[PDB]
């Protein structure tokens, strides 16, 4: 005989990711894994209130985190405590934020989200760049209009 606890634990590790840019959103998060081109979402509240009850993983997650951060310590340090989240798909996310040290089969929708976020970021960035350039040209055009108005302001006023 043997108790259900300490015998079988319904969660098993799938993949690890040292670099993952957590980006916030309106009412959710966004964790990016560029190694497999995926993005996961989770509600803003760390719904994993009692991940301690999943007492099995408590051991090895410490070990895996220790190994990963030992590898990564050449450039990064921990800038806070770790948390856990439960995505909508059913997976579970363990997050350990780090700051770089200053030198001085239902998974398709994740890929869809990744591609959509990439396109949105690119489009917004090019829009901002074009807007800034057009604004600079707009200040230049205002200067040109002011210079041209020095001759006959009535024509400029009638045109504007």
């Amino acid at each position: 005989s043997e108790s259900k606890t300490t015998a079988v634990c319904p969660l098993a590790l799938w993949k690890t990711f040292p670099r993952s840019i957590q980006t916030t959103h309106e009412d959710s998060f966004h964790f990016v894994a560029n190694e497999i081109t995926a993005t996961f979402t989770a509600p803003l509240t760390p719904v994993a209130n009692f991940t301690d009850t999943y007492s099995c993983l408590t051991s090895d997650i410490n070990t895996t985190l220790n190994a990963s951060k030992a590898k990564l310590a050449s450039t990064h340090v921990p800038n806070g405590t770790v948390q856990y989240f439960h995505t909508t798909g059913g997976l579970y996310l363990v997050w350990q934020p780090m700051s770089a040290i200053n030198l001085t089969d239902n998974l398709s929708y994740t890929q869809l989200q990744f591609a959509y976020d990439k396109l949105r970021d690119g489009i917004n960035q090019v829009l901002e760049e074009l807007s800034r350039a057009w604004c600079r040209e707009q200040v230049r055009d205002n200067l040109m209009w002011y210079e041209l108005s020095k001759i006959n302001p009535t024509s400029v006023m009638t045109a504007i």
């Binding site: 081109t37 990439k118 690119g122 350039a133 230049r140």
Partner: peptide, 20 residues
């Protein structure tokens, strides 16, 4: 020239993934 310093879109290859 107000430098219209654009930035095009790179191309990514979507690696096929699986769970189990």
């Amino acid at each position: 020239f107000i430098a219209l310093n654009l930035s095009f879109i790179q191309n990514i290859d979507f690696k096929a993934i699986e769970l189990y």
